[PDB]
């Protein structure tokens, strides 16, 4: 319940809540009154009580009666950038802050009360962050999270009191439109959600990792790649002695600035020669003797050079740097700038507590709260409670040489601590596996990094699970999508007014054929096509992390695998993921039986081609020049922003049904047949007018005896059914097997499939 006052919110309240007389209680008579600059921030709350009191008249407004809002400058010095008073009264609830940040806080604290009860006891409470950075790193790198996913993760977020998140991810670049490729982000779509992380207060900080780690952008600008003493370049490392190459990354800081309101930028700075030898690019240390008017400086030296000229391009904007602590390096004649943050990961280099004695501001980006789809991290195989229950681990404790662990002394400049949500495969997991996945884990940080510590009343992490994590739903706002329109069943898929959509080894623009949707546990659709039997799949086209990213691909038939399991945590059992989560699409309601069909993992929309659609990759990738160019009516996968095609997915019509059915589902050789499988197909009459000459057709098939002759029905009536019968026993073939039978009425035909195992 709510007493004990503020023992099942997350993060806990960092001061006792002080108990007054009576309480209050949330009706749909009350209003939300606030300033008008905090409208945005107030609309979460104002669209949450009226899912808590079942109704919807509550608004937010500059006057009335019930929630008021205060931003108070003179409170600054007593509540921070941050803090915020809670006090409720018979009279009200009141929340103060010297800003809207802290204010925005407040809001979530008096959500996550409403969200368990509706009445409140009378009292008030200062709460105020013992961290100032509680962060997020998203990987949004080489495969995409759709918008969706995102404007749920703010919410997430915005919820825990998390401010910061590091998206490492591609904007489409408007003056290099060769390297767009996919995944990208339409300039329109950022503006977007960096607009809803503005209201919520969170710093949505871009990374463009350089100078290496640039694939994605690099991979089809060979002139900008450092190049072998041979003259063999590498997608992965930015030419930093090339002036058009550093025109080129600078022109993509000048792009994101437009979208992203953050004072940071993060140029990530991982080590240059990602494990391989300067030696091997000699132009770098002669570069940098250029430039510093050195001769002994080193091929480190340009490394650092670039950085420093980095920072003083975006200092100029205003901006303040950011980089990854092994982008630290041992120097010679350029000496890395100390007016950068140092995001720190890697136990190896300069210690942290080095660091911060030195004057860095440095974030703890533990390497025990990284994520991953390809291979889980040990706080995904077992949860956080192995660092929540060890009291020698915190915020302020770094990762060290040697498994140890350094604990930074100079509090003042910790920022604060992230996790880390890396995909290193595509297709292993889909995102609504992950958005589950990093439960616990945000829910962990927000509170360690809000409250310094555990709550004084959780001893354990099962406590702490039991009291908090189990009883503080998600916002009601949280989820964004209907995650299941379409119920389990037989549909047909075309476009508005348009032909239908068919799927025999490729797929095309058809015309009469059937289709069967499986929902799956993360949400998604399996598209079986009944006349091939097979899978609408994507696997086929360029790639990055095993998952097919190319503009224009073209999806394919293939073999229908379980998608019945989800996979989270440690995964136990994940098996068959290339196959499952490319047969994965997720249907987005288009209103009045349209629908937006977008692959789970590729997260292209499946898509019609027009012959004028433009991109880079219809004519060359990664230097191999190849024309991959769609032609009208062509069946494609397209990113967001180059396609509204949407498709009608409606319930069959077919005056006909027919369903196989196998007994027993096992068969075995015999010469009696005792080992036979009886297939009995039922065939149905949906509509009004009476059917008849209903022929059919069994398969034939290698290594099996099955009945050669058709079966008829003379006639079927209208909601009426009728069932034929055929045996198949197995003579050499053993494995798994399926039947396929067709059943033809007039100028009506359909198919039924069944499966039997052959022992
Ligand atoms: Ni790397
Ligand atoms: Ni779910």
Sequence with gaps: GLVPRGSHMIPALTSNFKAAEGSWTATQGITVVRPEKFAASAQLLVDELNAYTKGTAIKGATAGTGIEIVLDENQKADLGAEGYTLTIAESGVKITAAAQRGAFWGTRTLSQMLRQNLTLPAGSVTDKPAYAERGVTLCACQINFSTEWIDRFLNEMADLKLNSVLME???????????????????????????????????????????????????????????????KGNADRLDITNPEAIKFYKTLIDEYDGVFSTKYWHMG??????????????????????????????????????????????????????????????????????????????????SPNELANDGYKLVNANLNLYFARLSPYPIQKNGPAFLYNDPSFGVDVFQGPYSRSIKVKKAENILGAKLSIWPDNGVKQTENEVEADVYEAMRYVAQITWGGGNPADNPTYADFKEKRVDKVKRSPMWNNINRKPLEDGVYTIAQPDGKDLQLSGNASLGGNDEWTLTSTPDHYYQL????????????????????????????????????????????????????????????????????????????????????????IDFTTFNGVAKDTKPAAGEIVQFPDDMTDDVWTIKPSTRSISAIAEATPKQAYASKDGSGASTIDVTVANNSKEKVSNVVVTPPVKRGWHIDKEP?????????????????????????????????????????????????
């Design 269 to 350: 700075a991982d080590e240059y020669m990602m494990g391989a030898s300067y030696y091997s690019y000699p132009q770098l240390a002669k570069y940098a003797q250029q430039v510093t008017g050195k001769a002994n400086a080193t091929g480190a030296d340009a490394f650092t050079y670039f950085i420093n000229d980095i920072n003083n391009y975006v200092k100029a904007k205003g901006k303040t740097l950011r980089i990854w602590n092994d982008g630290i390096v041992s120097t010679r004649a350029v000496t890395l700038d100390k007016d950068i943050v140092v995001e720190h990961w890697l136990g190896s280099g300069r």
């Design 169 to 231: 991810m591609k904007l489409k670049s408007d003056k290099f439109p060769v390297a767009n490729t996919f995944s990208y982000y339409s300039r329109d779509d950022v503006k977007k959600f960096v607009k809803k992380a503005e209201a919520y207060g969170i710093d949505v900080i871009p990374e463009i990792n350089s100078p290496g780690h640039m694939n994605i952008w690099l991979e089809n600008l060979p002139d900008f790649q450092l190049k072998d003493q041979s003259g």
């Design 528 to 615: 079986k096509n009944m006349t091939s039997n097979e899978c609408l799949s994507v696997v086929s086209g360029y790639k990055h992390l095993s998952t097919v990213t190319q503009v224009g691909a073209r999806p394919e038939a293939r073999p229908c695998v379980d998608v019945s399991q989800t996979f989270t945590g440690n995964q136990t059992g994940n098996v068959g993921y290339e196959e499952r989560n490319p047969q994965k699409w997720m249907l987005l309601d288009a209103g009045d039986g349209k629908f937006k069909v977008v692959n789970a993992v590729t997260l292209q929309r499946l898509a019609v081609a027009k012959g004028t659609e433009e991109h």
């Design 711 to 759: 079966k008829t029905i003379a006639h079927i009536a209208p909601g009426e059914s009728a069932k034929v019968s055929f045996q198949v026993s197995p003579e050499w073939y053993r494995g798994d097997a399926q039947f396929e039978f067709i059943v033809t009425a007039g100028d009506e035909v359909t198919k039924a499939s069944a499966k039997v195992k052959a022992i």
